[PDB]
Design a binder for these strands. Structure first.
Length: 856
DNA sequence: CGCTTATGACAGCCGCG
DNA sequence: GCGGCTGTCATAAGA
């Protein structure tokens, strides 16, 4: 067993560490670590240490971490750089584990848990923990068990014990259907009072103290709630036992006009699964509730139940407990699929950081680079403060709103990381500047070649080509590592246990590598990264902005020569690292007529791209490279999509309403020829969570009908949809939104100045519902359905909004399902955005429409 | 907690016999 | 009575 750390904390002058020893047992140790920092010295000083600029450095070994930290402030007062890794935990980590870390996840306690708190009033604020915790389910990855803590008697009810037998039975049989996979893994524990429950849980927590602590929202609700409850009841020093080092800090987050507080538990790494998912999932969702996600990921959600959750414990304690358990299990089932915790461990051990830092691109890269330079006696720059100045970013072409029959799209691979390597952008690489011509001049090889000596970016920056930059070297290394591991995955498929084993469990390294790669430019633009430099960040994006436009010229010119046309605009759209070309003239040179079926032309274009364009492109970028005199040429484009209408149909190809707003009928993607064509829709309301369900549906149909079938097909559907609108379920045709800053406009239960339309709706609901505690209340920052109300309604206003995902209290319903203004609803959510589609694609959604309402 | 480039729904203020 | 606009909110799409 090669040792490896579990958690590291610096608690003034001493480092507290939890680690797995050479025998796989968990041990903990206190170390009075002595760090070393560095200062520039004269050349007379003989040293093995140099900064990234080659300047000699003296190594200063401190008595304790306090001394070190003192010297830094004292060094800041003087005016001289204080070189070295200032986050000692990392340094200490790098010293105690200088070698590749191999971890046995098996020996790492990973706890996943959830809490239940019956509350008669509103949501039980974790900062105050006013109500009893009547249920806790805590799964421990080591024992592979679900430990359940049931509160039998509470100010809110005295209930019977929970039943496994029943829990396992079908819903038909009155059971909870707790999966059989876990049924024999549940360990049940009923308590007579909360104090017993809490104190028993706390001792359990000491025996099976978590290393990694996750669950769904455990960081904003469960952990603070447990901490505060135990604290309010017993002493504060009892709550602290929740920390293996008995130290905890109250951290206050104030993001997005809010202000919440979490509890830092020294000696534990919290990875709230809802955050891991938001990060490493890369799939923006209209909701992040455990149910929605669970459904999306596993095809089933949280246990279902009747009545208000706050009434569930009395009414159905049996389900209540089972619901608690199923919630813990749902999370595990997602991780059993996405392996995010596992992905977090790989990363943390690859960079040698606290696993929690997997949430910070900066901390991660700083650590990766820090160890890379240590290994070669180099000293990292001191972190510097930097005014936050916004620099120009990605380039985006204004498209001519229109229909586009045939379209091929191309992508640049890892543009930004490529740009760093190709130009060699890094702090200790800046070699100077050059008079800057206007960007377009560069995009057209008209401006004077910036240099004969240095690598250049259009923003006037010049870099050395001889030496190797720290940043570029570091990504390249990762790029290589990615190709290494995904090189094993290639042959790791030729007793398939000695072929598949790591073939997939190993490949996931390919993943993290990719994650570092795509997060480097992010760090570089962050003023808190010790390698940030405004000039460089700007050099990276400006070069990219030149890239896309220079290649647009090249692709334009080529197709024009090839097609015997001149001045014709082929590149119809460009977005940061990709272009979309119109292939009409290329389809014509052959004549749509000469094609067997659709797959025929989809094949023609594929070849044409791979055979005639790709090389003109690589030719073009190579020229650009000689122009900027770059270190090397990493500017590689790929044919992405091939789109067009089904051969023989009257469907337009696709269309563009504006920037980031378009739709295509794609038949091929990077090579994969789909069986049926797929709609690629970007920015249209069909892709918006605020668009009423039924409507995003009919809008998607409308788009499809437009692309694949003709205009006639579209009009038929439209007519039908109006004709049938009033017959749709109201939950389906009601728009949705988020209720933020309700009271900010709540003036006596009425709308103040600038009151947003939906917030106003909320208030109308509020007033028609004031006096009832038997009516689902409109919480803050939540989500609300919104419906327009016909003129002269009893709610006294144009609209109303109630809590989403739910029906509407029979108090106001019927009256709502009577005054809702279908007309206004249809127009606002369906007809107008469609009209935006049609006007752009040059189509009508209603026969005969004076072609003139398109002028002025 | 760990972002520029952009579009669309509303609100309200502005000349305008 | 409303186009042209500046401004608050919402939600994207890829990092």
């Amino acid at each position: 067993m090669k040792e490896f750390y579990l958690t590291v904390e610096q608690i003034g002058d001493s480092i507290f560490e939890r680690y797995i020893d050479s025998n796989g047992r968990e041990r903990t140790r206190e170390v009075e670590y002595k760090p070393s920092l560095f200062a520039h010295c004269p050349e007379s000083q003989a040293t093995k240490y140099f900064d990234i600029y080659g300047k000699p450095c003296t190594r200063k070994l401190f008595a304790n971490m306090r001394d070190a930290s003192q010297w830094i402030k004292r060094m800041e007062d003087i005016g001289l750089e204080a070189l070295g890794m200032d986050d000692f935990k990392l340094a200490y980590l790098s010293d105690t584990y200088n070698y590749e870390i191999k971890y046995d996840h098996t020996k790492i306690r990973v706890a996943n848990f959830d809490i239940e708190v019956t509350s008669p009033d509103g949501f039980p604020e974790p900062s105050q923990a006013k109500h009893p915790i009547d249920a806790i389910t805590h799964y421990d990855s080591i024992d592979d068990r679900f430990y359940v803590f049931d509160l039998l008697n509470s100010p809110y009810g005295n209930v019977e014990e929970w039943s496994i037998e029943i829990a396992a039975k079908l819903q038909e049989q009155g059971g909870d259907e707790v999966p059989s996979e876990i049924i024999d893994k549940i360990i049940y524990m009923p308590f007579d009072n909360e104090k017993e429950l809490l104190m028993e849980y706390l001792n359990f927590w000491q025996q099976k103290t978590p290393v990694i602590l996750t669950g769904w929202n455990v960081e904003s609700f469960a952990i603070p709630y447990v901490y505060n409850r135990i604290k309010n009841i017993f002493g504060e020093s009892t709550a602290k036992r929740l920390s293996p080092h008995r130290k905890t800090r109250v951290k206050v987050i104030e993001n997005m006009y809010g202000s919440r507080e979490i509890i830092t538990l020294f000696g534990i790494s919290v990875l709230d699964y809802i955050d891991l998912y938001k990060k490493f999932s890369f799939t923006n969702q209209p909701s992040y509730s455990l149910d929605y996600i669970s459904e999306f990921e596993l095809n089933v959600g949280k246990l279902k139940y009747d009545g208000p959750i706050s009434k569930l414990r009395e009414s159905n304690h049996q389900r209540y407990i089972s619901y608690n358990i199923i919630a813990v299990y749902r999370v595990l089932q997602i991780d059993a699929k996405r392996q995010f915790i596992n992905l977090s461990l790989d990363m943390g051990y690859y960079a040698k950081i606290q696993i929690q830092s997997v949430f910070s691109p900066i901390k991660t890269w700083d650590a990766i680079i820090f160890n890379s330079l240590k290994e070669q006696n180099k000293v990292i720059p001191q972190g510097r403060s930097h005014p936050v100045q916004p620099y120009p970013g990605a380039f985006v072409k204004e498209p001519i709103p229109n229909r586009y029959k045939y379209v091929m799209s191309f992508d640049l691979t890892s543009l930004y990381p490529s740009i760093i390597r190709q130009v060699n952008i890094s702090p200790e690489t800046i070699a100077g500047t050059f008079k800057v011509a206007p960007l377009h001049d560069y995009i057209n090889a008209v401006a004077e070649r910036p240099s004969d000596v240095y690598s250049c970016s259009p923003n006037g920056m010049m870099y050395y080509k001889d030496r190797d930059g720290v940043v570029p070297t570091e990504i390249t290394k990762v790029f290589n590592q990615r190709k290494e591991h995904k090189g094993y995955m290639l042959a790791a498929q030729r007793m398939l246990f000695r072929a598949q084993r790591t073939e997939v469990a190993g490949m996931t390294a390919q993943i993290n590598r990719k994650l570092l790669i795509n997060s480097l430019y992010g760090a570089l633009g962050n003023v808190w990264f010790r390698y940030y430099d405004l000039r460089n960040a700007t050099a990276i994006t400006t070069f990219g902005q030149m890239a896309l436009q220079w290649i647009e010229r090249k692709v334009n010119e080529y197709l024009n020569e090839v097609c015997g046309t001149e001045g014709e605009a082929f590149v119809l759209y460009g977005d940061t690292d990709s272009i979309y070309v119109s292939a009409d003239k290329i389809i014509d040179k052959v004549g749509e007529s000469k094609f067997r079926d659709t797959n025929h032309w989809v094949d023609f274009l594929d070849k044409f791209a791979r055979e005639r364009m790709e090389p003109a492109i690589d030719r073009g970028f190579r020229e650009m490279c000689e122009y900027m005199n770059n270190k090397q040429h990493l500017m590689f484009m790929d044919r992405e999509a091939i789109a067009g209408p089904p051969l023989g149909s009257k469907g337009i190809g696709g269309f563009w309403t504006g920037k980031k707003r378009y739709a295509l009928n794609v038949w091929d993607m990077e090579g994969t020829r789909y069986a049926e064509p797929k709609l690629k829709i970007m920015g249209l309301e069909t892709q918006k969570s605020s668009t009423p369900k039924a409507v995003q549906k009919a809008l998607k149909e409308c788009i499809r009908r437009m692309l694949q079938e003709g205009e006639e097909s579209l009009q038929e559907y439209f007519k039908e949809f109006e004709k049938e609108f009033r017959q749709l379920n109201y939950i389906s045709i009601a728009s949705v939104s988020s209720a933020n800053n309700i009271a900010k406009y709540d003036v006596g239960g009425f709308p103040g100045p600038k009151c947003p339309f939906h917030i106003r709706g909320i208030l109308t609901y509020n007033r028609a519902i004031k006096g009832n505690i038997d009516a689902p209340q409109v919480v803050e920052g939540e989500k609300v359905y919104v419906l327009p109300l016909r003129e002269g309604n009893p709610f006294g206003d144009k609209c109303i909004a109630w809590p989403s995902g739910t029906e509407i209290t029979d108090l106001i319903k019927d009256d709502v399902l009577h005054w809702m203004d279908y007309t206004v609803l249809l127009e606002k959510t369906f007809i107008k955005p469609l009209e935006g589609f049609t006007s752009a694609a040059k189509l009508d959604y209603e026969k005969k429409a004076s072609l003139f309402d398109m002028f002025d």
